[PDB]
């Protein structure tokens, strides 16, 4: 019994904290580096974490369920337990199939267009919300990076190689010269990748999950994965078309914003390692810097 034990513990905690909730079945459906999500009674999702723990995400679902006008479904929190050492959010599973590159490639041109229009429409509607009632949830990525650079300088920066230092400094120089943080701010999903997008039986967008990183931030943020060229995402043209449908936005700046975030990735990974005292992340990030430096 490996997998069997985690599930038992979480079944115990769910029943203990949610007085009249009976767990008849429970399985792991996903996990991050510091969280685990479970499917319970083939009906409920329970996102859990042993903290930095789930209060903001819940506030955002509550704000969005009150204010969004859309047929696209999002989580609606029925159960929550939030404490310093433990957080749990429960909601009814949104039913559907996650969008993937393989699926997209089987769709007709028209089906692809309609999906793109759906996404644009959802983003336009969310970005247009008056965010006053969630004003607390502001995120300044540039300032966050500066603070993370300071933490590097205070911890391991001096032990890095010249090549690692150069990569970091060359990123900081670019950050200082860019104008992409100076545009429209709005409420963004802020992790808007196709593993969070659900399709219904006609390949239309039916739901969106994981607003855990959402906040008032640069409008460009919600396009960075839609613009990404990788195995996990659909491709740059997909993001471009969505941008054109969404309208009133500088595409070249959206791409610059995406490229800068991408350049930061290995540094983000290093910083996560430092803050969470996980050496393997520090090592992975540094190695990634070498791989990027040597790519022709």
Ligand X SMILES: NC[C@H]1O[C@H](O[C@H]2[C@H](O[C@@H]3O[C@H](CO)[C@@H](O)[C@H]3O)[C@@H](O)[C@H](N)C[C@@H]2N)[C@H](N)[C@@H](O)[C@@H]1O
Judged by the rule CB under 5 A, the positions of this chain that interact with Cl ion are 282-283
Q: According to the 3-state scheme, what is the secondary structure of 67-82?
A: HCCCCCECCCEEEEEE
The interface region with Mg ion, picked from 20-28, 128-136, 157-165, 211-219 by CB under 5 A, is 211-219
Strand partners, 218: 185
262 counts as binding ligand X under rule CB under 6 A: yes
CB-based burial label for 288 (10 Å; 0-12, 13-18, 19+) = middle
Least distance to ligand X, CB of residue 193, Å: 4
Report CA torsion sign: 13, 19, 21, 24.
positive
30 binds ligand GNP (CB under 6 A): yes
The answer to the question of residue 37 lying near ligand GNP (CB under 6 A) is yes
Q: Which residues pair with 90 in a beta bridge?
A: 46, 79
Q: How far is the CB of 210 from Mg ion (least distance, A)?
A: 4
Nearer to ligand X, 256 or 262 (CB): 262
- Number of residues located near ligand X, criterion CB under 6 A: 11
In whole angstroms, give the CA distance from residue 23 to residue 64: 28
Instruction: Write each residue from 196 to 235 as x if it is in contact with ligand X (CB under 6 A), else as -, in one continuous string.
Output: -----------------------------x--x-x-xx--
d(CA 68, CA 49): 27
Q: Are 214 and 221 in contact (CB under 8 A)?
A: no
Residue 29 binds ligand GNP (CB under 6 A): yes
Q: How far apart are CA 110 and CA 105, in angstroms?
A: 12
Q: CB-wise, 49 or 127, nearer to Mg ion?
A: 49
- Out of ligand GNP, Cl ion, ligand X, none, what residue 29 binds, judged by CB under 5 to 8 A for its kind, is ligand GNP
Half-sphere exposure of 160 (CA within 13 A, CB side): 23
- The two most distant CA atoms of the chain are separated, in Å, by 60
Q: Using CB under 6 A, count the residues that bind ligand GNP.
A: 16
> x/- site string to ligand GNP, residues 62 to 91, per CB under 6 A?
-------------x----------------
Q: Of 143-172, which residues contact Mg ion (CB under 5 A)?
A: none
Q: Is 210 in the site for Mg ion (CB under 5 A)?
A: yes
Q: Does 268 bind ligand X (CB under 6 A)?
A: yes
How many Cβ atoms are within 10 Å of 93's Cβ, its own excluded? Answer: 17
| Minimum CB distance to ligand X smaller for 148 or for 164 | 148
Total count of residues recorded for the chain? 296
Check: CB of residue 171 under 8 Å from CB of residue 293: no
Catalytic residue, chosen from 1, 159, 191, 222, is 191
- Interface residues toward Mg ion, by CB under 5 A: 210, 212
- Interface residues toward ligand X, by CB under 6 A: 191, 193, 225, 228, 230, 232-233, 261-262, 265, 268
**Binding site residues for a gentamycin, as ranges?**
210
């Amino acid at each position: 019994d490996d997998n069997a034990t985690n599930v038992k513990a979480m079944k115990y905690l769910i029943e203990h904290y949610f007085d009249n909730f009976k767990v008849d079945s429970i399985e792991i459906i996903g996990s991050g580096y510091d969280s685990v999500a479970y499917l319970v009674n083939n009906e409920y999702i329970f996102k859990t974490k042993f903290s930095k723990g789930y209060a903001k995400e819940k506030a955002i679902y509550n704000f969005l369920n009150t204010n969004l006008e859309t047929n696209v479904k999002i989580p609606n929190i029925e159960y929550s337990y939030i404490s310093d050492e433990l957080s749990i959010l429960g909601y009814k599973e949104i039913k559907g199939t996650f969008l993937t590159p393989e699926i997209y490639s089987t769709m007709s041109e028209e089906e692809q267009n309609l999906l793109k229009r759906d996404i644009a429409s959802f983003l336009r509607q969310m970005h247009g919300l008056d965010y006053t009632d969630i004003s607390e949830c502001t995120i300044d990525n540039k300032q966050n990076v500066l603070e993370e650079y300071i933490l590097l300088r205070e911890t391991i920066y001096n032990d890095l190689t010249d090549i690692e230092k150069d990569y970091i400094e060359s990123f900081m120089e670019r950050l200082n010269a860019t104008t992409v943080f100076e545009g429209k701010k709005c409420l963004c999903h802020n992790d808007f990748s196709c593993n969070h997008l659900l399709l219904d039986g006609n390949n239309r967008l039916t739901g969106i999950i994981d607003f855990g990183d959402s906040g008032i931030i640069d409008e460009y943020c919600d396009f960075i994965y839609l613009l990404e060229d990788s195995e996990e995402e659909i491709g740059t043209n997909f993001g471009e078309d969505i941008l054109r449908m969404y309208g009133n936005i500088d595409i070249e700046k959206a791409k610059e914003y995406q490229d800068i975030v991408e350049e930061y990735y290995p540094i983000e990974t290093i910083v996560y390692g430092i803050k969470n005292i996980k050496q393997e992340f520090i090592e992975n990030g540094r190695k990634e810097i070498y791989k990027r430096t040597y790519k022709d």
